Design an enzyme around this catalytic site. Structure first.
Site, PDB file in Angstrom:
ATOM      1  N   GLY A 197      -2.811  -1.597  -4.182  1.00 19.39           N
ATOM      2  CA  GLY A 197      -3.106  -0.524  -3.991  1.00 19.39           C
ATOM      3  C   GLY A 197      -3.423   0.472  -5.052  1.00 19.39           C
ATOM      4  O   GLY A 197      -4.273   1.239  -5.523  1.00 19.39           O
ATOM      5  N   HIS A 198      -2.628   0.237  -6.092  1.00 19.43           N
ATOM      6  CA  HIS A 198      -2.766   1.169  -7.501  1.00 19.43           C
ATOM      7  C   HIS A 198      -3.782   0.845  -8.184  1.00 19.43           C
ATOM      8  O   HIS A 198      -4.687   1.638  -8.194  1.00 19.43           O
ATOM      9  CB  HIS A 198      -1.459   0.985  -8.377  1.00 19.43           C
ATOM     10  N   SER A 221      -3.106   2.469   1.389  1.00 19.19           N
ATOM     11  CA  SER A 221      -4.402   3.042   1.174  1.00 19.19           C
ATOM     12  C   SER A 221      -5.539   2.478   2.133  1.00 19.19           C
ATOM     13  O   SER A 221      -6.438   3.393   2.719  1.00 19.19           O
ATOM     14  CB  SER A 221      -4.993   2.235   0.074  1.00 19.19           C
TER      15      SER A 221
HETATM   16  O1  UDP Z   1      -8.047  -8.814   1.181  1.00 23.21           O
HETATM   17  C1  UDP Z   1      -7.824  -7.597   0.983  1.00 23.21           C
HETATM   18  C2  UDP Z   1      -6.795  -6.853   1.428  1.00 23.21           C
HETATM   19  C3  UDP Z   1      -6.877  -5.668   1.037  1.00 23.21           C
HETATM   20  N1  UDP Z   1      -7.899  -5.003   0.208  1.00 23.21           N
HETATM   21  C4  UDP Z   1      -7.930  -3.525  -0.066  1.00 23.21           C
HETATM   22  O2  UDP Z   1      -6.853  -3.477  -1.404  1.00 23.21           O
HETATM   23  C5  UDP Z   1      -6.402  -2.255  -1.015  1.00 23.21           C
HETATM   24  C6  UDP Z   1      -4.843  -2.611  -0.555  1.00 23.21           C
HETATM   25  O3  UDP Z   1      -4.074  -1.674  -1.150  1.00 23.21           O
HETATM   26  P1  UDP Z   1      -2.876  -1.006  -0.110  1.00 23.21           P
HETATM   27  O4  UDP Z   1      -2.464   0.517  -0.712  1.00 23.21           O
HETATM   28  O5  UDP Z   1      -3.480  -0.499   1.104  1.00 23.21           O
HETATM   29  O6  UDP Z   1      -1.795  -2.013  -0.114  1.00 23.21           O
HETATM   30  P2  UDP Z   1      -1.130  -2.670  -1.316  1.00 23.21           P
HETATM   31  O7  UDP Z   1      -1.645  -4.121  -1.731  1.00 23.21           O
HETATM   32  O8  UDP Z   1      -0.575  -1.902  -2.202  1.00 23.21           O
HETATM   33  O9  UDP Z   1       0.314  -3.198  -0.492  1.00 23.21           O
HETATM   34  C7  UDP Z   1      -7.022  -1.663  -0.054  1.00 23.21           C
HETATM   35  O10 UDP Z   1      -7.902  -0.735  -0.745  1.00 23.21           O
HETATM   36  C8  UDP Z   1      -7.628  -2.550   0.911  1.00 23.21           C
HETATM   37  O11 UDP Z   1      -9.113  -2.149   1.351  1.00 23.21           O
HETATM   38  C9  UDP Z   1      -8.918  -5.729  -0.213  1.00 23.21           C
HETATM   39  O12 UDP Z   1      -9.984  -5.508  -1.097  1.00 23.21           O
HETATM   40  N2  UDP Z   1      -8.896  -7.242   0.309  1.00 23.21           N
END
Ligand code: UDP
Ligand code: CL
Length: 282
Positions: A16-17, A235
Site C-alpha cells: 500500500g505505501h 487502499s
Molecule cells: O494482486 C494485487 C493486490 C493488490 N494490488 C493493489 O495493491 C494495493 C494494496 O495496498 P493496500 O493498502 O490495499 O494493502 P497492503 O498491501 O498494504 O496490505 C492496492 O492499491 C491494490 O489495488 C495489486 O495491484 N495487485
C-alpha cells in the site's frame, strides 16, 4: 523541488505505501526513493532512483537528505516516529509531508490522510502550528485505471472478488474463499510477494469456481467485473469507493480500525474476527 520518498514495501509490510507513493510521485518532476532492501519489496517496480538504505538508522536518512539537497521529504512509513520527524526537521530543515492512516501525531509541514474517513479536525493538537492538514477522499491516491474503469460498463463475470491487499500474510484469501458456496464464482487477486502463494494456488486448482489472478495489471477491471467485493480495509477501500462497488471489509490489522469504524457507520459489513491471534495463519 528535488523530492525524496521514505517508504518501504515487503511481504510483511504490504504494498500500500509504495503503490500510493507511486501515484503521488507523478505530481513531481525530480523524484527519488529511499528504501530498505526487504523480501518481497516492490523496489524493481519503482521507476526512479532508489537509494538503498543499509540500516534503519534515522541518521542514515538524514545524511542522504543533506548530501543530495532534497527539498521535500515525503514520509510514508509506520516505523518513522514523531521524534524521528522532529530530528529530521532540526538536522536538515527539509520540508516534510507525512502520510498518516490511524490519527497519530506527526511533526510535519503537510499531513496527508488519503482515507475517506478522515477529517482535518481529527488532527487538532496532533500536528505543528504551521502544518497544512489534508484529509479525506478529495486527497485519495488512486491509479488511473480506476478512473478509466468507473466510466466503462462491464458484464459481471464473478459473484465475489477477494483481495486482501498485496501480500495477505495471514492467508485470509484461502479462509474467506473456503466459506463461500462452491457454486459462487470467485476471483482472487494477490501478488507473487504473498508468502502463501504455493498453498493458495494448490487450493485454487482444486476448486473450479475459483479464478486466482497473480500480479494482475488491472485490479479496477476485476472489481468492476464482480458483483460483491471482500477486501481488506486498506487502499482497496478508496478504490472500491471510487468504483461505487458493493463490498464487505475485513479489518486485517489494528492500523485499519479507523477505516473499519467509518465503514460500519456508513452501513458496510465489517469483519473484525481476523484480528484475533488464532487467525495469524491459514
Ligand atoms: O494482486 C494485487 C493486490 C493488490 N494490488 C493493489 O495493491 C494495493 C494494496 O495496498 P493496500 O493498502 O490495499 O494493502 P497492503 O498491501 O498494504 O496490505 C492496492 O492499491 C491494490 O489495488 C495489486 O495491484 N495487485
Ligand atoms: Cl497512476
Amino acid at each position: 523541488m528535488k523530492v525524496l520518498f521514505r517508504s518501504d514495501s515487503s511481504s510483511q509490510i504490504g504494498f500500500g505505501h509504495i503503490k500510493r507513493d507511486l501515484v503521488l510521485a507523478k505530481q513531481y518532476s525530480d523524484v527519488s526513493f529511499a528504501c530498505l532492501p526487504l523480501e518481497g519489496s516492490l523496489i524493481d517496480e519503482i521507476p526512479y532512483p532508489v537509494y538503498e538504505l543499509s540500516s534503519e538508522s534515522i541518521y542514515e536518512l538524514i545524511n542522504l537528505i543533506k548530501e543530495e539537497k532534497f527539498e521535500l521529504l515525503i514520509i510514508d512509513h509506520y516505523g518513522i516516529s514523531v521524534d524521528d520527524e522532529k530530528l529530521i526537521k532540526l538536522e536538515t530543515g527539509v520540508k516534510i509531508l507525512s502520510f498518516d492512516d490511524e490519527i497519530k501525531p506527526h511533526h510535519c509541514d503537510i499531513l496527508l490522510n488519503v482515507n475517506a474517513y478522515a477529517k482535518a479536525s481529527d488532527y487538532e493538537g496532533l500536528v505543528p502550528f504551521k502544518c497544512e492538514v489534508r484529509c479525506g477522499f478529495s486527497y485519495a491516491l488512486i491509479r488511473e485505471e480506476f478512473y478509466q474503469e468507473a466510466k466503462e460498463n462491464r458484464k459481471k463475470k464473478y459473484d465475489f472478488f477477494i483481495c486482501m491487499g498485496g501480500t495477505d500474510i495471514k492467508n485470509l484469501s484461502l479462509q474467506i474463499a473456503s466459506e463461500l458456496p462452491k457454486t459462487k464464482i470467485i476471483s482472487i487477486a494477490t501478488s507473487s510477494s504473498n508468502p502463501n502463494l504455493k498453498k493458495l494456488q494448490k487450493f485454487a486448482k482444486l476448486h473450479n469456481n475459483i479464478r486466482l489472478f497473480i500480479d494482475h495489471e488491472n485490479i479496477a477491471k476485476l472489481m468492476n467485473e464482480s458483483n460483491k467485493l471482500i477486501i481488506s480495509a486498506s487502499s482497496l477501500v478508496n478504490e472500491a469507493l471510487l468504483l461505487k462497488a458493493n463490498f464487505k471489509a475485513i479489518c486485517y490489522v489494528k492500523n485499519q480500525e479507523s477505516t473499519a469504524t467509518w465503514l460500519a457507520k456508513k452501513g458496510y459489513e465489517v469483519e473484525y474476527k481476523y484480528l484475533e491471534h488464532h487467525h495469524h495463519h491459514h
